[PDB]
């Protein structure tokens, strides 16, 4: 079957051969099977669930990321957080005021 990778910029989360997966695509829930055509999509926060070789069930929660598919390879480029709120612009203000004070 295909070889599933789950990785982040900080760490490798999972690696192994996988028979099928369930993953929440950008526009809706998606299932991947061996020999799937090349596909690229972001993934919304939630559970991605996996069956390894011999159909052993594995569940992984993701804050988000990008899912893509290649011949024999599935790679999930997960990230730490949603990041959509952009509250850290406030964090950048104090760096300026403390430099001015």
């Amino acid at each position: 079957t295909y070889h599933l990778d789950v990785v982040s910029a900080e760490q490798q989360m999972f690696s192994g051969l996988v028979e099928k997966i369930q993953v929440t695509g950008s526009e809706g829930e998606l299932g991947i099977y061996p020999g799937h055509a090349p596909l690229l999509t972001a993934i919304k926060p939630g559970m991605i669930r996996i069956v390894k070789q011999h159909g052993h069930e594995e569940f992984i929660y993701l804050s988000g990321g990008i899912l893509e598919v290649q011949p024999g390879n599935v790679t999930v480029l997960a990230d730490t957080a949603i990041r959509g709120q952009d509250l850290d612009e406030a964090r950048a203000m104090e760096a300026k005021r403390k430099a001015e004070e």
Partner: protein, 284 residues
């Protein structure tokens, strides 16, 4: 008071020497752990680089502000620095190289501003008086990308709105255990040389929802990964520099101890001789 205090000074120097000897080994172990983290970091970045290369240099070629060349009117940097002392001259070397390049760009009349990681850079560039737009401190060991999301977000906002035309990351590189080098490398626009392929973009990816938004998110995640990797490598270089500095400090203490002991022995002999001359003279 050679008979009174020099004996205490010798003991204090001995204790300090033993403490530095312990610190050298602690730094050497932390360097190995940082090396493991650094080696773990790379494959995610290289895979995302492969995907962005496929999207950019495919048969159909897209254009994006983060990718296209733009003329220079403002230049930006983000700089990583240690939050703890020792570690030799790493920070000062990096800061003076950054100042050299900043002065070169100033001479062309190009306004510059800095994003700052670590308090040492904050303090040095506040003393210099360079424009610092963003700061983050207090990662220590095990730094997190989550903290990094901020400054890169604001630097991106500056770049894409026209406020910034080029972006550089300033960090030291862990060449190996024995050697480290301060370096500056470009982030925006995408400097990576072009590549060519056939399999990719022939058996092209199905795009959901559309190829462009995925390219924007992909580029943002890529530059974020680049700065995280730079931070980790700078931390490893800091650990190596601290190990070296502690070795030097231990050797210096060991060299000081013997000279103090020679002086103490001279004083010890002199006191005995003087007091015995006094005793003999007093027996008139």
């Amino acid at each position: 008071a050679g008979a009174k205090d020099i004996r205490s000074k010798i003991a204090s120097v001995q204790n300090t020497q033993k403490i530095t000897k312990a610190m050298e080994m602690v730094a050497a172990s932390k360097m190995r752990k940082s090396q493991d983290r650094m080696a773990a970091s790379r494959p995610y970045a290289e895979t995302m680089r492969k995907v962005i290369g496929h999207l950019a240099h495919g048969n159909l070629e897209y254009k994006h502000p983060y990718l296209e060349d733009r003329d220079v009117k403002r230049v930006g940097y983000l700089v990583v620095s240690t939050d703890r002392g020792l570690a030799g001259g790493l920070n000062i070397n990096l800061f003076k190289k950054l100042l050299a390049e900043m002065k070169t760009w100033t001479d062309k009349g190009v306004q510059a501003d800095l994003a700052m990681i670590g308090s040492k850079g904050v303090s040095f560039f506040n003393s210099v008086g360079g424009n610092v737009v963003a700061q983050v401190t207090g990662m220590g060991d095990n730094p997190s990308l989550s903290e990094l999301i901020g400054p890169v977000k604001v630097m991106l906002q500056a770049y894409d709105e026209g406020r910034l035309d080029k972006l550089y990351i300033v960090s030291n590189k862990f060449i190996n255990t024995m050697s480290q080098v301060p370096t500056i490398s470009q982030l925006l626009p995408l400097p990576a040389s072009d590549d060519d392929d056939l399999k990719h973009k022939s058996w092209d990816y199905l795009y959901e929802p559309d190829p462009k938004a995925l390219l924007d998110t992909l580029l943002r995640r890529y530059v974020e990964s680049q700065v995280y990797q730079g931070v980790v490598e700078n931390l490893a270089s800091e650990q190596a520099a601290r190990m070296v500095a502690m070795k030097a400090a231990t050797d210096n203490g060991g060299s000081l101890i013997k000279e103090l002991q020679l002086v103490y022995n001279k004083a010890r002999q002199a006191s005995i001789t003087q007091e015995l001359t006094e005793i003999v003279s007093g027996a008139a």
